Amino acid sequence: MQKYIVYGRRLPSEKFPEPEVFRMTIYAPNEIVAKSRFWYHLKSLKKIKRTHGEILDCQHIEENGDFVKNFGVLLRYRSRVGQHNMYREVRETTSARAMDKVYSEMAGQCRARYHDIQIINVKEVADEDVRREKVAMFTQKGVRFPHPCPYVHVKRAARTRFQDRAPHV
Amino acid sequence: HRFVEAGRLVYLGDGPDKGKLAVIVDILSTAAVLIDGPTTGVKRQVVSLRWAMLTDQVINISEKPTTEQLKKEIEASPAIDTFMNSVWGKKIQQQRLRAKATFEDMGKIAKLRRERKMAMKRIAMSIK
Amino acid sequence: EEIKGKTFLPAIFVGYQRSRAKQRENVALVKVSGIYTRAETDKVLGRLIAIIHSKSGKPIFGKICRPHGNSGMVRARFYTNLPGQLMGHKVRVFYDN
Amino acid sequence: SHRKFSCCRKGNLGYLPRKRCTRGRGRCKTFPPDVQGAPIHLTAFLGYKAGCTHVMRFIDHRGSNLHNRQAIDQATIIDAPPMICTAIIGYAKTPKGLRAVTTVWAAHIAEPAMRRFYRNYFHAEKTAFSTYMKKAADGTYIKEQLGRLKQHADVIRIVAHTQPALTPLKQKKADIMEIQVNGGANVAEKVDYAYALMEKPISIKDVFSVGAQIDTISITRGRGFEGVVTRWGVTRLPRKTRRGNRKVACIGAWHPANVQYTVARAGQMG
Amino acid sequence: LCSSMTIKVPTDVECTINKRVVTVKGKKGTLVRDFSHAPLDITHANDTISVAVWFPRGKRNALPRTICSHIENMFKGVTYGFEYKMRLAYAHFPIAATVVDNNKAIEIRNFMHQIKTRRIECLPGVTIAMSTNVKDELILRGISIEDVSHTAARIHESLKVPNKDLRKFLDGCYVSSRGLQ
Amino acid sequence: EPTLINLAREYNQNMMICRHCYARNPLRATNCRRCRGTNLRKKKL
Amino acid sequence: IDCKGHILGRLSAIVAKELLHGHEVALVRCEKAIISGAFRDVKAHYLKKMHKRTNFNHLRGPFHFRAPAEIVRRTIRGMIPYKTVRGSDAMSRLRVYDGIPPCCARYKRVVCPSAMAYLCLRPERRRCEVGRVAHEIGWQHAADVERYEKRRLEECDKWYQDKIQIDKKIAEAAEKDAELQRINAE
RNA sequence: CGGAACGGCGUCGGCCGGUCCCGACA
RNA sequence: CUUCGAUGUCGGCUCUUCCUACCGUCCGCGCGCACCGGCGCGGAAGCGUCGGAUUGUUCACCCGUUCAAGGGAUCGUGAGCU
RNA sequence: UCUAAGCGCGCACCCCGCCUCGCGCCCCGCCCGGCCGCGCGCCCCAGCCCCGUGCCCCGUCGCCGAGCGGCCCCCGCCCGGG
């Protein structure tokens, strides 16, 4: 939901005076979950527990949302059968908003919650590179389709309920 | 007729900017769209196509036109005027006025609405 | 009667503030017409309302106190307490005072 | 556990409730299908069972042994004195079923019909039809009301009354019965045929034919309170049963915990 | 995404599409088929009828082509007609087929020496004639493929051996040729 | 007779039977129409 | 309320609430209400729901009314506290009819759009009209209701042609004190 | 719609390989 | 576990109901289905599933016939009986 | 390619009829009397033919009549036989 670049390292020691600083880009709802996800990875990836480590920064990045881009995300998710790898493309104005779409699609179709899914990388695919037909259908220059759901103006009927005529669509 | 294409004037059915006029810029998916309303009050946002009912007028638009380029075209195009002078446009203006009515005003109108119901009975009886 | 040229906005006394376990007869839930949203309820909040007793014929006055849900229903308190045979009977939020 | 030996239930449950008939005499309940453009005919007649005789008949049934052979068969005589038609009811079939438009009565109704309308004719005030005979007998009333039947009715029936004076019965009151007129090309053909018969006798010879089949409808002979063995046909229990052999031994099982409607019980037979 | 298909209107046929009712007018008659059972944007477009289904999911994609084919069968049937040929097949007992009415019904008798008589009434718009030059054959000719096809299925269904082995007892009336003339 | 026996065999003998469903199914079938997706067919002469 | 096209349950719940607000609702053309789902399944539910009956005495048991307005009424008696006086009185306030009877022909009819099946139910959810299920379970007046609603429509249109003509005269009287109210009514 | 091993050319979403303007014999 | 200041304890007789995991009859389809028959399968609980010798027996077994499925209902059925 | 849209035929089963009961209601007769209400286009949603309104005051001034739609009222026994 938000997008954060979290910097953290292991605590300084006498055998290793300067420890390596590792930066990860974590998409998370809040700073505390971003820090939590960072440590989950740095425990498995580089054997650094939070107890044995210091987080030196959890910066929030406010990416410009003026124009739509195509995003391409690769993730690893866990089913009731076993872990699977997956590449999902999404067209959204920003990367933080693109992870919301991906997480929503993975919750609805893959029944996968945020804590199961690990995001290997997010990237901006160009219109030429898009590999999903849902994404590619709208990359085309002039895309015109009737309103997908025009009956959805039933938002009038709750406030109205009775009406003299049944409304046309 | 009436399609989700760049430039279609869209009435905003719901959301923070309900009751407002915007132009579609790009279609993220059938579900969504990026609209902006420089002549009106809508800032640039991605809304669900559900919240935006299409209007007949489509404004000429340069692809991916920012706010400043979109404003120049939205101001120049006579589409917003044609819609606002239309039957839907006039209703939207009438609906806008109705919402800002105090309890004192609601009473004023209800007396003047009863007066009309009775006037039509007086007129319909006259039409023999 | 005290109320003769008092114009009023139609309303209905739906029922008492209740839960599926305990009923609170002190506060009565009123559906004011033309008000479908909790934010719309502010315009008719703190206003005099009355329910005409069906046996007596005389008005039991009261005031609208606070909104009940997101859909307009308001919570209202009456000078006595509504008898319970008056549910569905109309309440009158006067345009004047 | 199961019964162990297949046997049917004793009794038809479509003849339930087995109660004394509340209807005064046999009623027709349904009438023969109307049939469009048939020859115009009257569907029913009222009669009184007289006796039974036994007849010798020559049976021309090919494939039966008794083909070109002779058979003595039981036959039931039903006395049918002519019936005076007294009225004409029209029913319009509606969403709620047939609903009668109106019933138009003759300007003169005979004494046996009037007798049906009062419990004791002698001590009766005799006010029935008093205003109606005055409103009718001008001719115009009947025609205007018959016109209402032609425009707003589909099922035209004739209301007839038996004449008990021509019978050995001690009744003295006419059984009043509606008889449907079937076969008209139009509704107006049925009402017009009915007017020809109004206030006039109708005989069985016109209503039915020899060789045709008829559905007799009547209330049966009565035997009063009767036991399960006679009323439903249940088997008498062995002779040593204490409390008697003339009963259904179990009226059900522990579950369902109430006696069932399908279990034979003592009550009115006939 | 629009799943589209296109059909080309023969100028022998003048066709009018209102709502989803399609009427074709041709030399042998006028056929009217209503396609309002499904969601389609059928368009006249000069000489091309395009079915055009929109947002297709699993079987919405299937619809554009069946409709386009159901329309070209209408065009072909009005222009040339449809003739389904049915040959009575028998061994010991000859089937007797008599065309009755104004060639609008058929009676098939002597099926396996059966006392039953099987009259099949042709659907409105199909006429049954006997073979003029083929022998033991019925010609079903009409402007509608669905009418001519259904009428012939009923004629086949009527002549069904009761029990037996249908593989050994392979008698019955069977459609032999289905074709425009 | 010959061709008519072939036309009858077309309508009476040339088919594929699903072993579970027992249903008649076309000769190029892969899955039975009724025994959904049941792939086991045959037909005997 | 004309139950033409109204989803049975979704209209009933809107009506049951209005019956409990003392609103005196009457439902016409119940035969044209819609039950979602394949008819074969909808009929099967209404035929399974008729199998429940008190074994000892079916006259003591649940009553299965085969008429469309009587099915529609039992649907509302489920969403109403009928045993209590509040709900027993509310059930009294409801009048339900198949077709528009002469009693209800001259009332102004509204339609609740939220409960209609065009707006609810996706194209393909296989709709089923209540009247068809009624004739399968055993209603006997399906034909008679149509024959009367064919003649009702015929008068309705003749009346409408006269009504368009009379309204022009009503609308033509646009000059009076009514303009003064219209200017103020803003 | 408690539920299994196993089926599905129901429908959506994936992962990994093979061919296709050397047209997926003409 | 629930009942011991008591819920009468097998089979038969009598009587109703219920289930399907269907034996015959019905409808399809398959056979190593020529026919007759058998046999497998899906739908189907409307009707039928009887008379007897021995045994307290349910069961068993045998004889017979329009050839004869299986069960539940406080192991249905004692102020009904034996 | 029997199915996905569309369509035909289709079971001793199911539902309806016929039959048994029938609360209510209806028409009529006697009687023909009060009381109450005030309001009608239709279709279709992948044409939706110009929409996204309206009503929003059942007393809050509405209440005559007309016309329609209601509702209520109304109807003996004893005795003797079957």
Side-chain angles (χ1 to χ4, degrees), chain B:
Chain B
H1 317 88
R2 240 176 200 142
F3 278 83
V4 187
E5 42 184 68
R8 194 60 84 174
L9 215 62
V10 254
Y11 179 61
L12 260 119
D14 195 44
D17 297 89
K18 166 162 25 128
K20 286 269 216 35
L21 273 186
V23 260
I24 285 153
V25 160
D26 221 278
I27 291 111
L28 315 223
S29 32
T30 46
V33 101
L34 166 80
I35 43 126
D36 182 28
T39 193
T40 351
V42 197
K43 336 234 28 229
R44 221 132 149 97
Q45 37 213 54
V46 165
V47 297
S48 244
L49 236 345
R50 331 230 328 199
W51 285 3
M53 357 195 357
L54 308 171
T55 90
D56 33 61
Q57 297 298 309
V58 43
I59 302 232
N60 193 80
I61 268 325
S62 119
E63 301 115 278
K64 282 93 48 189
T66 85
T67 284
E68 296 84 11
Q69 182 78 262
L70 177 85
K71 168 149 225 288
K72 291 320 226 95
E73 309 162 285
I74 217 197
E75 289 272 73
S77 216
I80 156 102
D81 304 297
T82 315
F83 181 67
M84 275 280 108
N85 288 59
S86 93
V87 166
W88 194 6
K90 282 171 172 15
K91 223 15 121 184
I92 290 165
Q93 299 178 294
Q94 274 187 37
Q95 255 114 242
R96 265 154 184 178
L97 221 56
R98 197 65 137 221
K100 8 139 83 46
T102 69
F103 191 58
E104 289 84 30
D105 286 318
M106 280 178 136
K108 279 169 228 176
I109 288 159
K111 168 61 80 215
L112 273 158
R113 250 215 323 255
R114 161 67 137 190
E115 278 179 4
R116 187 202 312 187
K117 185 126 116 316
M118 284 311 123
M120 285 317 121
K121 264 308 233 232
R122 197 237 6 229
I123 274 320
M125 269 326 147
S126 101
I127 307 292
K128 263 328 144 296

Side-chain angles (χ1 to χ4, degrees), chain G residues 36-49:
Chain G
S36 40
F39 154 77
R40 52 147 343 154
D41 296 359
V42 173
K43 192 216 3 204
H45 196 215
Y46 280 82
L47 234 25
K48 145 110 178 130
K49 102 177 24 225

Side-chain angles (χ1 to χ4, degrees), chain G residues 94-108:
Chain G
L94 170 79
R95 342 161 238 192
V96 264
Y97 305 111
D98 11 68
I100 332 240
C103 337
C104 249
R106 272 94 227 159
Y107 289 1
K108 25 120 158 27

Side-chain angles (χ1 to χ4, degrees), chain G residues 60-177:
Chain G
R60 203 165 272 243
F63 295 128
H64 301 108
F65 290 73
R66 326 281 225 265
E70 280 305 303
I71 294 164
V72 171
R73 148 179 309 270
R74 283 286 302 264
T75 305
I76 325 181
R77 211 196 61 172
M79 316 184 176
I80 246 174
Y82 83 100
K83 301 273 223 332
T84 90
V85 159
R86 196 161 114 92
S88 215
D89 294 0
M91 256 344 251
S92 106
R93 264 163 250 154
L94 170 79
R95 342 161 238 192
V96 264
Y97 305 111
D98 11 68
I100 332 240
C103 337
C104 249
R106 272 94 227 159
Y107 289 1
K108 25 120 158 27
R109 295 160 228 87
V110 289
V111 269
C112 343
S114 21
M116 307 205 50
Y118 75 110
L119 287 173
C120 314
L121 115 77
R122 45 163 16 127
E124 222 32 83
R125 216 23 85 162
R126 286 254 150 87
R127 357 203 136 188
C128 168
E129 214 215 35
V130 169
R132 152 102 159 262
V133 154
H135 147 75
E136 319 281 339
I137 76 189
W139 180 33
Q140 319 264 253
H141 304 299
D144 323 326
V145 144
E146 186 64 75
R147 175 216 297 140
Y148 268 64
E149 266 294 295
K150 256 224 11 104
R151 102 210 357 190
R152 227 243 336 159
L153 273 205
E154 276 167 26
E155 186 253 70
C156 239
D157 68 62
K158 286 168 180 219
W159 164 88
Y160 176 55
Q161 303 307 123
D162 231 26
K163 133 109 171 289
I164 1 161
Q165 183 55 57
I166 70 168
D167 168 48
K168 194 249 344 141
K169 299 137 41 71
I170 294 149
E172 265 209 338
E175 22 258 274
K176 235 348 235 124
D177 68 314

